[PDB]
User: Fold this.
Amino acid sequence: XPXX
Amino acid sequence: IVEGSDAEIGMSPWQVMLFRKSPQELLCGASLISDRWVLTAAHCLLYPPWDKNFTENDLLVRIGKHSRTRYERNIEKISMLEKIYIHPRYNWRENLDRDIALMKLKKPVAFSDYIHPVCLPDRETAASLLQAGYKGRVTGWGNLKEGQPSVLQVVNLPIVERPVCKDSTRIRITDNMFCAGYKPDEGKRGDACEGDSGGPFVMKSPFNNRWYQMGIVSWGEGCDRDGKYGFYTHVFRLKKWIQKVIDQFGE
Amino acid sequence: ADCGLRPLFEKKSLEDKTERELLESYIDGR
Ligand SMILES: *[C@@H]1O[C@H](CO)[C@@H](O)[C@H](O)[C@H]1NC(C)=O
Ligand SMILES: [Cl-]
Ligand code: NA
Assistant:
């Protein structure tokens, strides 16, 4: 999902 | 960065590290676009599903770095943030559309051999360069595999055709994103990964020999998986917003 | 303004170790  | 290599000294002098004050840790990458403005991904600052919502006082930026961890007294500059600006239509609830944020520093940073801004593309540079099969470059201090590097990593990756990007994922992609990475049939590897988020995807223009930031590391599903691609915020398409913010709040 | 021109590379007429891969993709990538 998001890079994070 | 997966399947990259150590950057050379001063190779990416616009690279910025977004750093949490407490506990002290790397949060994200970012880029220097002028002496007082830094560009990053909105999701580095605001992502409610993970209870993330940083305020200016929670963060620092570190500019001119090479080592991931060492304090580089000689060369790095540590700056405080005056204000964070997140795109108002950043769609965190669905697909990370418009994954972009600006940070204004509390004082201008002095440029040096290690600290220097990247250009933002004009319309024709974007049209000409952001085409499938042309390569850009991603840098960061993120994970080496889906495991942290000693120094800044670099990898070059080709831009991918939109239908291939679209068919690779169930996330609803938009024209404010592009994807990059090798296809399985190209027999090469490489990707950004966690911790590289917010940092720059750059291209060297053959028209004027300058480096332009075309993308921001935004999202992906794992890192360096076969048939998956990294996704990047499309900087040119969001440049109208960048210009509005800087015009209103001061270069 | 002076953006995008690196002190230790373009400003010294020095190339980094992999930038030619980017330039060559303009020839061969499409
Ligand atoms: C984030 O935190 C700020 C306070 O620092 C709050 O005003 C704002 O509503 C929060 N944003 C979201 C979307 O949760
Ligand atoms: Cl194959
Ligand atoms: Na892949």
Observations:
- Chain B is about 10% helix and 30% strand.
